[PDB]
Design a protein around this ligand. Sequence first.
Ligand code: HEM
Length: 399
Amino acid sequence: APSFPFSRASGPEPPAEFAKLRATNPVSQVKLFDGSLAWLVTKHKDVCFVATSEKLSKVRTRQGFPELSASGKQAAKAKPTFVDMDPPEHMHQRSMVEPTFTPEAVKNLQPYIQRTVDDLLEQMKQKGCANGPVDLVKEFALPVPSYIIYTLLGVPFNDLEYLTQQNAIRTNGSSTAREASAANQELLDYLAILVEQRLVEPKDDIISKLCTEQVKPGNIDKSDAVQIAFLLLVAGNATMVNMIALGVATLAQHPDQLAQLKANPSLAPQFVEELCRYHTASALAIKRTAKEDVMIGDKLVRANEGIIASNQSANRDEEVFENPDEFNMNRKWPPQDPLGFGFGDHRCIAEHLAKAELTTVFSTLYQKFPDLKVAVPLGKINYTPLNRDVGIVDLPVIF
Ligand code: HEM
């Protein structure tokens, strides 16, 4: 059995194994970092089944749960938030914070989203690139999702820049473990203090809603509220940064499609749908353990055996998406959903927010900077390490 996670075939490409497995062995065993074996599911139809089957569990203290690193195994010990829950606990807690992420709520947030993107682009203009390229990640891709999610949680304007930097330090590949866990402690301590404040005078933010509607009635206590606020911050932010940077890089590699976006910014939604299919930047989140024996394709998954469902592989499934390895924002979409955001009950709570952010960015970026260009050769883009989720560490641009 091959070791898993697989490495990406190159900087922007998924692992090569998935294509071979989809054609010859779509449900296979892989070897995890700790020698334990797990089942790997690679086809769109089977990913959808894993994501929704009531015989499979996300509870991480069940025997056989497939942790991919040593830190996930100790992370498993902490009191769980709804990302690691099964029904009916899962939706009991998830529904406490879902109101802010509904399509209606996200529609009302659109003016604020546009203003955040506008402001940060204008800052970047004023900084200019008269002394060399600027890092689109640091100047724009990192603060855009960071400022929005922090603001929704209830962080006041003056604290945004410091906390944005701390959260970036958490997941920066060149941080030592001491730097990353200190940045991590910094974030938890700040949220605990903000929870204490909102318990005394609530405002109009997610933490205030949790304090008022759940903590004070006793449905949860303040430490649960900190953990839920922390989950909402860290679950999607690094992914959002990578999607933004990956969109810019992808457009630089497909000049003809960038020219269409420049001449019709209303194509941004369709560009965003294809970006999220093609660059599946969160590909290791759909994991389960089997509560009972369960049949997936021609394999029997025994109870207490772990499953990993690759939505990355599913998004390149030739049986669903014609010419899946071509980036085509003008593609015709089948009936089946792309799985960039997962599937079923656990499907990314922030799907509508994330798409509205991505769509606002790509309908605005090139209207502001019609000559935005990646300043290094495309073969020299600094992608994330090949053993991690696809992403871009830094992206020098001129405009
Ligand atoms: C392009 C950006 C993003 C992508 C591609 C993405 C992707 C995903 C994926 C694949 C999952 C697993 C879903 C499943 O189990 O079926 C997920 C879950 C989740 N995401 Fe996102 N995400 C993004 C942005 C965000 C943001 C901005 C937030 C928070 C503000 C967020 C919060 C969550 C949470 C809380 C879950 C767990 C939901 C649950 O288990 O009920 N994500 N996301």
